[PDB]
Amino acid sequence: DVSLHNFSARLWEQLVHFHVMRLTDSLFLWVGATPHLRNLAVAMCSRYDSIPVSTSLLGDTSDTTSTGLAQRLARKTNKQVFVSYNLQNTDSNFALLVENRIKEEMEAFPEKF
Amino acid sequence: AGFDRHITIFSPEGRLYQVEYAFKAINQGGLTSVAVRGKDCAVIVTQKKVPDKLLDSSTVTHLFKITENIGCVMTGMTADSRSQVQRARYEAANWKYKYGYEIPVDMLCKRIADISQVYTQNAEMRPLGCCMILIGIDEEQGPQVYKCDPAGYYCGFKATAAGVKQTESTSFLEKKVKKKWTFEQTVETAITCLSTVLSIDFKPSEIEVGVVTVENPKFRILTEAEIDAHLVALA
Amino acid sequence: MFRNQYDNDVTVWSPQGRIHQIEYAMEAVKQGSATVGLKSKTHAVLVALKRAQSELAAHQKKILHVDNHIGISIAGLTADARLLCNFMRQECLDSRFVFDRPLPVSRLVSLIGSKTQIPTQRYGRRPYGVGLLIAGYDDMGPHIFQTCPSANYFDCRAMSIGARSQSARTYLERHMSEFMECNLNELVKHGLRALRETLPAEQDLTTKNVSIGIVGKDLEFTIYDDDDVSPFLEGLEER
Amino acid sequence: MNFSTLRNIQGLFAPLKLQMEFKAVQQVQRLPFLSSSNLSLDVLRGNDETIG
Amino acid sequence: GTGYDLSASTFSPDGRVFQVEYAMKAVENSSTAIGIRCKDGVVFGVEKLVLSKLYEEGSNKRLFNVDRHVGMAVAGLLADARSLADIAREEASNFRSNFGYNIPLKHLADRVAMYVHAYTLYSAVRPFGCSFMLGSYSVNDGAQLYMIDPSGVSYGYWGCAIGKARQAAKTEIEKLQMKEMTCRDIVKEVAKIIYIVHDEVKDKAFELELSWVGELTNGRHEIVPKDIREEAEKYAKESL
Amino acid sequence: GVVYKDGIVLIHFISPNIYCCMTTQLISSNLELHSLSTGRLPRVVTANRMLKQMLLVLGGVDVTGPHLYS
Amino acid sequence: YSFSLTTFSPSGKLVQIEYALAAVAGGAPSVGIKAANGVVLATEKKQKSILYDERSVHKVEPITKHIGLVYSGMGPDYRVLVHRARKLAQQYYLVYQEPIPTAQLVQRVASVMQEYTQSGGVRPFGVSLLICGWNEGRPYLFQSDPSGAYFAWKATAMGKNYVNGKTFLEKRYNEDLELEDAIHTAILTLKESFEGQMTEDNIEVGICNEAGFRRLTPTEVKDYLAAI
Amino acid sequence: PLVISKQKTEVVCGVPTQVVCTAFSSHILVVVTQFGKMGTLVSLEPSSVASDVSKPVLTTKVLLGQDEPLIHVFAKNLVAFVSQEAGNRAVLLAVAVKDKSMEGLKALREVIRVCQVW
Amino acid sequence: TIFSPEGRLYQVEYAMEAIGHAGTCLGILANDGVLLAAERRNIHKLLDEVFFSEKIYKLNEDMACSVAGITSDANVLTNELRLIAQRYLLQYQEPIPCEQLVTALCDIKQAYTQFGGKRPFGVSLLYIGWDKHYGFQLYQSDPSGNYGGWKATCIGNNSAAAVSMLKQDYKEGEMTLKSALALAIKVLNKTMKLSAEKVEIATLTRENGKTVIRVLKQKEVEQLIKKHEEEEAKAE
């Protein structure tokens, strides 16, 4: 079937919400502070490359957060992962906090990912 | 490139020449309007010109009904004036929907001026070359006359004029107001001012008159018979 | 001399009352090879010419299939031709899939013109640079239509577009009085003879540079190429 | 009172004019820059005197 | 207006917009068309030039049918005229759907004029380059005739002319007494005027297009029958 | 909750001569802005409409006379 | 005597800001004086004709219970800035449940003004503002330029002939000045170079105290003018 | 939850199908799959040059999958009403259906309507 | 936002040239403290002894800065610095390092020279502060986004002569607060007749495990300039 999970955390001075949809060997993840969707990417594990094959579907091509996060998640889980990262913070270490929170939720509830 | 080809560029003396050119565009019509406020009435009188004999004269007008109790007269470009009238009607409807009561004349004039101000600070759009004069009656203040301009400046008046011969009309009205009005005297004063300024003897089919009164607070447009009766009384 | 300031954008009027970018775009149709279209009382025929280069380097699709009763020929920009073909295919497929009835050719051409008029008025856009010949059959009979980059369309008895198509147009005008009573064979012969007028005095039609598309009553749109054009080519006389 | 009502009462031109004005004013927009105040946008939208 | 004529959002030092003036000048390189309002109807007339003999008869029409009761005659760019005709059809259909009765010609003219004027304020678009007239008839409203120009101004007329030779056509129309005539004479007068204001040397051979809407048609816009057209053309030729 | 003569006798504060029995702060601020812009005392109908779009007894006196809503 | 198409002037300043300041310097005079207890604001409201209605528009406007301001320059820009200032004050009161300090409001308005000096397709505001307030039993007086640079003053003037007004204020200012004497001095500074007859209808006066900010009724202005 | 979603499964034309709808402030996400996976990804947006801006025309673009006219026709006829009833908002559709027919589309439209979140 | 055919940024060059006409600022690092010295170009008797173009801003209790450029841009940048410092303090329960703060501001400054269609900030900075990682520090910044640490530097008008004199008369590891103040006064007098009312002096030091930032008074400046005059008279 299809399962839905939702959680949130407070980082710096903002509240960040995470939405997860689980399918048959698939994953869709949305991260943002406001209900907007302007970025999207997909990554898959392939035997013709050492880095998982990925491409950008929506949004600006100068932002690489969604692509890299999808690639790392696909490498870790061996699934097809869609990632929509919509946070708009200029600090480069905020994404590290977001990734750490995502990881923590992953070992917290392994059955929902 | 240039201080006068850009709406969003100041001149070395601190001037915006596009707004001045928009002001100059008002005189392209070639007509004059006069508004005079009385003790318990307001009168607007404009000049009508129908030169072509193949043109239906019933379709030429410059007096508009914004609301059941608000009138208007426009001077300048015809299409710009009609667009401005439509925008004013939309704003009045929106205000009524949002606040539950009819918009006042000063509030409508302020909203129009606020809209007009934005056109002067952005480079992708141009100001409208027209001037708006509104009349009405307030619940606790009486008759009111207001006027707009392309620059976004508005004020209340006891008597005002627009278009060509505006300076002469203001000079004529200043002496009368200083010297120091019934319903018949206001219309007579406005018609006399227009006639003396234009140096033309008027006919009942050459002018348009719109009035508002405390007794009957609804905007009304006078008919040719009534205008002729007023002209006979004046003469 | 004075045209420099007014011939760079499509949203700028010239002081003479002209837009030069539309004319420049219309000039791009003559960069492709020639095409000929003609119709009879019961049939509509499209005849096209292929580029003189070798066939090894590239295969050219000059005549395309849109529906069971509509086919087109192109001359101009390949990307614009592809876009217009996709639009027409989607329109016809939607009509059939929804209402279970074919789409009229006049309606399709009107939709094409309405779609192509838009980019001639907006800033930062350019007109389409392709020309089309449309042949179809419906309740009203055969039809031949011509489309222009200026978003104009015409109803024709016979027309030719492309590079050096004036001679073909002259031949079609001269011999247009006998197309109605002709059958399929004579119609294709007339089309081939008209197309041959755009070649030098020594060249001749060959199976490797001729494409034919035929639609008509009790016959769906069909494209003949390579050895399929031999029956039509046989019987032609010397120039 | 919305775009459909305006179209039904006045015509197709009024919502088109409103949207063109909105798009022309909204040209001051960029992601990697600092926070901005939309003064002209609030003036045109009519919400320059109310708090959401 | 050099230096102030590259955009529609710029004012001239004397208070003029030159892009709109160029758009209105763009109408003068098109064949002339006239329209005369009569006692019981309106009659249209277009001088149509032939481009080639390869075109089917009845193509490139310049007299449209906006609705069941509205006729339209255009001049200028053809694509702009077709888009404006589509806009007018959409407006008429919407009014019919909402209010339940046929739209008066005044409201339709106002809506189309405002739509045209909306394109003369911004630098992201360009003004339309066409002019057109609308005609209608009703038992309780009589005959109506209107004009819309690229600037966006609409007026009611008794006799109108647009195109390359509008001045001579207007001078010829001014000599008529259309307020007391009938359609059967107005058609011949229109044909005579069109034949008079045509240039034989500068322009090649042409064909005459005529239409009316009026009482004898019961509020419908149609094409003149062939016999009446032939009689009117013969009268015009013998008068000229 | 009785409409007396030339007034209403009836308590959150939302505006001068307008009382109702937090969104009330927002409505009060909006009414203050409206009064500053117009230059006149606010009307009861405006408060009623603002509360209606916000989502209880409302009573006040304006130029039109005593009012009472529910 | 010089027109420049560049961004920075040869003196090291923005050219458009200099042009906006030149536009400001051609406006009506304004005067602000800070006394021992309170601040007084005054301006010239001369009208072109008797046909005008003075009770229609005002140049001295209140922002909140304890803040008011006056301008010198273009009217529409002042009108569009006043609404934003009021909205910012209301937002601060809603969020922090306390009246906004004068310095914070000046900072926010200056930031809004500065925002328009960097973007493309817009032009800077052509106004200069004088802001007065009262916080913790201590009066304040600020002045802001079109570019958004603000300083705190004790007595200043802008508009026409502002250098002579500044000289007059420097010559006739005292550290222990009272509110009544401050009002008299402001009216005298306005009267200096008035080219006309001053009445109670062609000038505007506003004062700030510990009780708040308010605009003087013309009867009070006439009473004050009677003393002079 | 900042985003509201609904899901519900049935059997349409003899084959099981799952429908999930999720609402954003700029997009509506509709998933209609018969394999349990996201297949073709389609984006529908209102046109920016529409003359009737109250009821604009929709532009269809394929982001991932096979590009055919049938895909465009199916997507438009399937989510036009979803786009219209949401206030002229864009729709992101992920569809994986074995066979396409008008009866199946009409059957699936009711299931989509049942899971309304807009 | 456009590369020159020789590989240069004209907007950045114009901004730096414009800054080259601003006021003169000084910074000297000593063994027990660090100081800033600026020039007061404009002055009036009617200013309110607060917000009087005080060129030495206070970011935190540990840091301070000076500006040579556009006042409004300086205000924006200083406000952003204050929010950045407060946010880092709230996140990590620890004061932000000076180099980290400078890098955070320089990233914002650099983004404007690469993205969008906005002009870069025409402001140069001078940071002084203390932290447990490195102690007393002194940095500099320019519109292009470059930064670096120094021991004595000057920005503004006639900065080349000030730098030359500083490098001629500066000795590492042998100078204290008094010698630094005397050298700063001498350099400012040479690069500017100087009056005690035309300068502003601020100092930073540690007092029993607590950073103290002070601004020198008019009397102290007069005493210092009188001592300098006495020394220069004794020299001749």
Coordinates of C-alpha atoms in Angstrom, one line a residue, chain A residues 11 23 28 35 41 72 85 87-88 113:
Chain A
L11 CA 16.2 24.6 13.8
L23 CA 5.6 3.4 -2.2
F28 CA 9.0 11.0 -1.8
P35 CA 3.5 25.1 2.0
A41 CA 14.7 15.8 -8.2
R72 CA 22.8 10.2 -0.9
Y85 CA 14.0 20.7 -0.7
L87 CA 14.3 25.8 2.4
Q88 CA 15.7 29.2 1.4
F113 CA 11.0 4.9 5.3

